[PDB]
Amino acid sequence: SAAKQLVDSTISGNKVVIFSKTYCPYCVKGKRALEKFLPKSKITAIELDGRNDGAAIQDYLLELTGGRSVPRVFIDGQFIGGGDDTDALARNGKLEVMLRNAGVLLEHH
Numbered sequence: 844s845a846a847k848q849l850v851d852s853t854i855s856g857n858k859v860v861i862f863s864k865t866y867c868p869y870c871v872k873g874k875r876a877l878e879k880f881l882p883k884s885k886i887t888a889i890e891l892d893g894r895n896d897g898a899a900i901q902d903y904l905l906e907l908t909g910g911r912s913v914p915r916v917f918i919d920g921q922f923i924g925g926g927d928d929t930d931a932l933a934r935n936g937k938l939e940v941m942l943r944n945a946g947v948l949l950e951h952h
């Protein structure tokens with residue numbers, strides 16, 4: 844399907860992806876967590892309240908990840924969870940490890 848192809852191609856073609864809705868505070872929280880390490884222009888935020896086929900994309904996200912809710916965050920193709928999860932991973936060091944492994948974050952000393 845178009846929705847499946849969109850999601851698969853997006854997460855395999857972009858290192859940091861957040862499927863989002865503009866109005867959702869969990870999406871905002873996930874974005875702010877990622878922005879501690881990366882600029883906005885390196886975060887691929889797909890707004891499913893803007894896309895006409897947003898519901899179809901959420902349906903595929905249920906198939907791929909186990910849930911439909913936004914956000915759904917992917918690092919180098921790996922689903923890492925929603926907004927609370929992404930914020931927790933930012934705080935606990937694991938997000939940085941994933942971003943460095945993905946080649947989009949340098950060590951800074």
Ligand SMILES: N[C@@H](CCC(=O)N[C@@H](CS)C(=O)NCC(=O)O)C(=O)O
Nearest residue numbers: 867868869912913914925926927928
């Ligand atoms: N605890 C979840 C909450 C996510 C959530 O429930 N988001 C709402 C929007 S505030 C949602 O997806 N609603 C259903 C929908 O938009 O389909 C997280 O951390 O991401």
